[PDB]
Design a protein around this motif. Structure first.
Motif, PDB file in Angstrom:
ATOM      1  N   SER A  13      45.586  11.364  69.953  1.00  0.00           N
ATOM      2  CA  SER A  13      46.400  10.487  70.776  1.00  0.00           C
ATOM      3  C   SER A  13      47.453  11.285  71.536  1.00  0.00           C
ATOM      4  O   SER A  13      48.128  12.136  70.949  1.00  0.00           O
ATOM      5  CB  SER A  13      47.095   9.416  69.929  1.00  0.00           C
ATOM      6  N   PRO A  14      47.616  11.032  72.837  1.00  0.00           N
ATOM      7  CA  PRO A  14      48.649  11.755  73.589  1.00  0.00           C
ATOM      8  C   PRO A  14      50.051  11.246  73.314  1.00  0.00           C
ATOM      9  O   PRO A  14      51.010  12.020  73.415  1.00  0.00           O
ATOM     10  CB  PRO A  14      48.238  11.524  75.048  1.00  0.00           C
ATOM     11  N   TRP A  15      50.200   9.966  72.968  1.00  0.00           N
ATOM     12  CA  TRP A  15      51.524   9.403  72.733  1.00  0.00           C
ATOM     13  C   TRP A  15      52.085   9.797  71.372  1.00  0.00           C
ATOM     14  O   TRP A  15      53.254   9.512  71.097  1.00  0.00           O
ATOM     15  CB  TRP A  15      51.473   7.881  72.856  1.00  0.00           C
ATOM     16  N   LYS A  16      51.275  10.437  70.524  1.00  0.00           N
ATOM     17  CA  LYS A  16      51.713  10.803  69.180  1.00  0.00           C
ATOM     18  C   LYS A  16      52.994  11.625  69.205  1.00  0.00           C
ATOM     19  O   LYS A  16      53.961  11.316  68.500  1.00  0.00           O
ATOM     20  CB  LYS A  16      50.603  11.582  68.474  1.00  0.00           C
ATOM     21  N   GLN A  17      53.017  12.684  70.015  1.00  0.00           N
ATOM     22  CA  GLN A  17      54.177  13.566  70.049  1.00  0.00           C
ATOM     23  C   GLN A  17      55.402  12.870  70.629  1.00  0.00           C
ATOM     24  O   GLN A  17      56.528  13.150  70.207  1.00  0.00           O
ATOM     25  CB  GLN A  17      53.840  14.827  70.850  1.00  0.00           C
ATOM     26  N   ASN A  18      55.204  11.947  71.568  1.00  0.00           N
ATOM     27  CA  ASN A  18      56.317  11.383  72.322  1.00  0.00           C
ATOM     28  C   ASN A  18      56.999  10.223  71.599  1.00  0.00           C
ATOM     29  O   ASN A  18      58.231  10.149  71.580  1.00  0.00           O
ATOM     30  CB  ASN A  18      55.830  10.944  73.706  1.00  0.00           C
ATOM     31  N   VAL A  19      56.225   9.307  71.012  1.00  0.00           N
ATOM     32  CA  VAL A  19      56.833   8.157  70.346  1.00  0.00           C
ATOM     33  C   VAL A  19      57.608   8.596  69.113  1.00  0.00           C
ATOM     34  O   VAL A  19      58.652   8.019  68.787  1.00  0.00           O
ATOM     35  CB  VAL A  19      55.767   7.103  69.995  1.00  0.00           C
TER      36      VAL A  19
END
Ligand SMILES: *[C@@H]1O[C@H](CO)[C@@H](O[C@@H]2O[C@H](CO)[C@@H](O)[C@H](O)[C@H]2NC(C)=O)[C@H](O)[C@H]1NC(C)=O
Ligand SMILES: *[C@@H]1O[C@H](CO)[C@@H](O)[C@H](O)[C@H]1NC(C)=O
Lengths: 89, 275, 150, 365, 50, 62
Positions: free
Chosen positions: E18-24
């Motif tokens: 998932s790309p949003w893993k690091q950001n959320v």
């Protein structure tokens, strides 16, 4: 507690060691094996202990409230003196 | 105990009723005379004290309400004294000395509860063999004692906090001297025995006679001759008895009444009667 | 997004006749945010299923507003299918066990995110990728009060 | 035994007994020996062990009659020849024995044993738990040093006041007032008696405060723990919990004859009343602590009216063992029975057979 | 009744890769310092006592 | 070791799952007419014995 966070293990960014020990740590907490380790190094004598020395009554906190109610009742006699005398004369 | 007359109320509210009796005192000799000054002075100063000194009742038909409620103020103050004094006496917990060897006092010996054993004994080696008790040994190795009799004298003199040692000797100690208590029960079982060099001729006979004496009953019956229980038990199950210190302050005020009366009566009457 | 009905975190209320759920104000008179929820049958024990738009608001829904505001998102919310959170159980007369409930609809591919009171443990950590915890808690027992006689 | 089997007078209205109960013959020789005695009376047996016996006959078509043991309880190899229930097997007076028979190595040599069907242990039972205060005399709140000073230093104002008032008030009358005011019933006479009345209130309220401290920090005895407690391993004691009942010739009689003779020497105060007649002594007050197996104790702890507390319980155990049905020597019935208990281990009838004869009915609040 | 006999936490969930893993996971931490998670506690899980 | 998770550190160096929780805390140092008046006196003494006992137990609350 304010701004609650937790301790951790800092490792190099984008490493291949992350997934292996991430599941190992979750294994430890999810089995209670950290509870035995926690009660050996983090223990105090008076953890389950609390007894105030006193709250000495030598302080006007509740007896003061009693004191001023007496003054309130004391004024009732003065008011009764006028009402009793005027209504009887 | 401490400050009988001064522990619960020796502050702002202690002198409150000292002047709260004066405000009502004069306020009655001016409530009756203005549609005797001593009569109101002695009455309120006495009804608060529940003394049997009968004097003038409130003459005014309206003044009777304050007196009937002034007693209530006097009725409520002394009750708050009793409850407050009990709380202070309850929370004077004497001692919660120790459990067996698992207490947090044992594990972390910063300064309090230093414990020492006899050097080079069996116990001092057992604490070096157990791996869990490493810090406990690391504190005991700093200082210890040379003889068992030395530790008993030091503990009795309150120079050493706790003493770990054999149970058979220690049980005879507390029961006889009666200044000491055994902390619970044993946490390690072992035994005594004779000791002989290996491959000695008597290694079989001496072991045999010990077994025979146990079934015979001589060894069991001999213990009473040198081991006994007497003169001291689990008594002192009463964690208070009012000392001769707070009552002395209570005895102090009655003395002040004596000196006040004799000095004033002898001196003042001479001046008043002469004039 | 998949969501579940839990008392203090996600509320579920029927919408008004016009479609939009009625507004309300908090103790300080501030507008409480609400989003429109599709999903459940509105009849859990007494009918097979039929969906209907409803209204949601609560802890998780409030955080999703702040979360998506920074991320520049475009979000839709639909509730879970059969209430249960999720577990591993061998389906009837099969070979291997497969995930249940809310976790199932995300691993299958029906949704891309779960904003709900989901716990952290080893079994779920194998197949799902969590985030840093946003609340700490434990387990406690609830009992009925005892009368203070008289 | 009490819980495992029960024997009764069957039914005064029908001769037999209520169904699901089997008649058994019993021999009681409590009479003289002039001509003869025939004590074999048609009683009836109900309990858990009868259910097992009634459940093996339906399996292997067994047929039987029931006869009691002519004497107290189980036995052990003593003096060369056994004595008790086992003797009836050894002396060819019977074939098999059924009931609370704890398996052991001292008896397995002379008679075989099957797989057990329970999980029992040995625990200590003590008298009822009671909460009572211990004020000896109402004069406790002060030491006697204060009383005498209080009594005597009160007598000086008795004499001093009449001296400062006679120079009216009678000499005898003055002493009466002094006692009366300190018990709250009744410038020459006022000044000292004013603060003197304060002397009464100041300390009389402390008596209430002290007694409020006696009745809070006191506590009862700790209902001493299991075997290794300080009261047991010191058997030189004449007014402790003074009971080590350990019913005579019992199975646990040999266990306290293993290594340490400090216990068997003081265990000689045993009472031959098998279980129940000597058990009520623990409730009566002449017996303090009785040692037996936890199987028949917990049921007696709960099903009995009132409260009589056993030791810690599943943790306060030593030498956990089990009860099993014995197969006599030179008798290959082991295969027949061993299938029965194992089959009864599989189908799950252990719980159903337990809840109809062993349960906790009314636990103490 | 009494204290708690287990300790765990909550968290958002996203599939593997998932790309949003690091950001959320950054926003969740970033909101903890700003006291945002504290007032949300004060909004509708607290201040509702009997 | 005793290392805490926060905003800036997580930017440049990765982290594991927290195994010990912590935060920010503050710590500081420590005839028939008179038969009724008898009843009223009976209620008065009990009311005080109730009052002083009630306050004393409330007073014993750390
Ligand atoms: C997570 O957030 C960061 C910061 O906003 C994103 O990084 C930006 O990504 C855009 C997309 O092309 C770039 O134009 C910006 O230059 C990036 N910022 C910087 C400072 O270089 C990142 O893309 C976000 N993660 C994902 C998966 O979108
Ligand atoms: C967010 O996404 C929209 C596309 O819907 C885009 O136009 C916009 O530039 C993005 N960023 C912001 C800050 O709105």
């Amino acid at each position: 507690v304010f701004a609650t966070t937790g301790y951790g293990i800092a490792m190099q960014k984008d490493s291949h060691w992350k997934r292996a020990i991430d599941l190992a740590l979750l294994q430890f907490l999810g089995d209670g094996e950290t509870q035995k380790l926690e009660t050996v190094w983090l223990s105090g004598i008076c953890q389950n202990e609390k007894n105030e020395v006193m709250s000495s009554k030598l302080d006007i906190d509740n007896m003061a409230g009693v004191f001023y109610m007496l003054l309130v009742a004391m004024g009732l006699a003065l008011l009764v003196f006028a009402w009793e005398h005027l209504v009887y004369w | 105990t401490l400050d009988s007359f001064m522990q619960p109320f020796q502050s702002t509210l202690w002198l409150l009723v000292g002047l709260s009796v004066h405000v009502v005192a004069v306020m009655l000799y001016l409530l009756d005379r203005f549609s005797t000054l001593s009569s109101a002075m002695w009455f309120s100063w006495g009804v608060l004290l529940n003394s049997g000194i009968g004097e003038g009742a409130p003459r005014s038909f309206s003044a009777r309400i304050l007196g009937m409620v002034w007693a209530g103020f006097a009725m409520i103050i002394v009750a708050s004294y009793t409850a407050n004094l009990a709380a202070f006496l309850v929370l004077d917990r004497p001692e919660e000395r120790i459990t067996g060897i698992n207490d947090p006092r044992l594990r972390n010996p910063s300064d309090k509860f230093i414990y020492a054993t006899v050097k080079q004994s069996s116990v001092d080696i057992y604490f070096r063999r157990q791996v869990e008790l490493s810090t406990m040994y690391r504190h005991m190795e700093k200082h210890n004692y040379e003889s068992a009799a030395e530790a008993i004298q030091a503990v009795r003199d309150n120079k050493l906090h706790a003493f770990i040692w054999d149970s058979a000797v220690l049980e005879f100690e507390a029961s006889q001297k009666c200044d000491l208590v055994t902390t619970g029960e044993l946490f390690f079982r072992s035994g005594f025995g004779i000791g002989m060099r290996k491959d000695s001729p008597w290694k079989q006979n001496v072991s045999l006679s010990i077994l025979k004496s146990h079934e015979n009953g001589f060894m069991e019956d001999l213990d009473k001759t040198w081991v006994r229980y007497q003169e001291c038990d689990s008594r002192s199950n009463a964690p208070a008895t009012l000392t001769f210190e707070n009552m002395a302050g209570v005895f102090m005020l009655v003395a002040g009444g004596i000196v006040a009366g004799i000095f004033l009566i002898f001196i003042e009457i001479a001046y008043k009667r002469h004039k | 997004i998949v969501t579940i009905h839990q008392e203090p975190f996600v509320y579920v209320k029927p919408t008004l006749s016009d479609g939009t759920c009625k507004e309300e104000f908090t103790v300080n008179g501030d507008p409480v945010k609400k989003v429109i929820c599709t999903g459940p049958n509105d009849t859990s024990p007494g009918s097979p299923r039929h969906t209907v738009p409803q209204c949601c608001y609560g802890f998780c829904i409030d955080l999703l507003i702040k979360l998506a505001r920074t991320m520049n998102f475009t979000y839709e919310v639909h509730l879970v299918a059969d209430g249960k959170f999720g577990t591993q159980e061998r389906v009837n007369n099969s070979n291997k066990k497969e995930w249940n409930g809310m976790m199932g609809e995300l691993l299958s591919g029906q949704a891309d995110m779960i904003v709900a009171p989901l716990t952290i443990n080893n079994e779920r950590a194998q197949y799902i990728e969590f985030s840093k915890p946003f609340k700490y808690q434990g387990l406690t027992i609830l009992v009925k009060k005892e009368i203070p006689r008289s | 035994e009490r819980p495992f089997v029960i024997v009764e007078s069957p039914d005064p209205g029908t001769g037999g007994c209520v169904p699901n109960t089997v008649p058994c013959r019993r021999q009681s020789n409590h009479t003289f020996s002039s001509g003869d005695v025939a004590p074999y009376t048609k009683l009836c047996c109900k309990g858990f062990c009868i259910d097992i016996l009634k459940k093996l006959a339906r399996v292997v078509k067994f047929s039987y009659d029931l006869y009691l043991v002519t004497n107290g309880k189980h036995g052990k190899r003593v003096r060369g020849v056994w004595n008790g229930m086992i003797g009836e097997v050894y002396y060819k007076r019977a074939d098999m024995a059924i009931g609370s028979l704890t398996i052991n190595e001292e008896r397995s040599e002379i008679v075989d044993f099957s797989v057990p069907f329970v999980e029992t242990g040995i625990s200590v039972m003590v008298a009822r738990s009671n909460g009572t205060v211990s004020p000896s005399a109402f004069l406790e709140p002060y030491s006697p040093a204060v009383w005498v000073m209080m009594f005597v230093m009160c007598l000086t104002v008795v004499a001093i006041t009449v001296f400062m008032f006679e120079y009216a008030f009678t000499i005898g009358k003055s002493v009466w007032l002094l006692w009366a005011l300190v018990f709250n019933n009744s410038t020459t006479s006022k000044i000292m008696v004013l603060v003197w009345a304060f002397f009464a209130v100041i300390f009389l309220a402390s008596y209430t405060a002290n007694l409020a401290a006696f009745m809070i920090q006191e506590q009862y005895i700790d209902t001493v723990s299991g075997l290794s407690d300080k009261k047991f391993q010191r058997p030189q004691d004449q007014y402790p919990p003074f009971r080590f009942g350990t019913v005579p010739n019992g199975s646990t009689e040999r266990n306290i004859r293993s290594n340490y003779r400090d216990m068997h020497t003081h265990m000689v105060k045993f009472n031959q009343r098998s279980v129940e007649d000597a058990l009520t002594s623990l409730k009566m007050g002449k017996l303090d602590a009785f040692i037996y197996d936890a199987a028949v104790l917990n049921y007696m702890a709960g099903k009995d009216e009132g409260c009589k507390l056993v030791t810690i319980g599943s943790g306060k155990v030593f030498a956990t063992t089990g009860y099993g049905i014995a197969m006599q020597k030179d008798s290959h019935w082991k295969r027949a029975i061993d299938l029965a208990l194992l089959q009864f281990l599989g189908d799950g009838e252990t719980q159903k057979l337990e809840t109809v004869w062993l349960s906790g009915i009314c636990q103490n609040e």
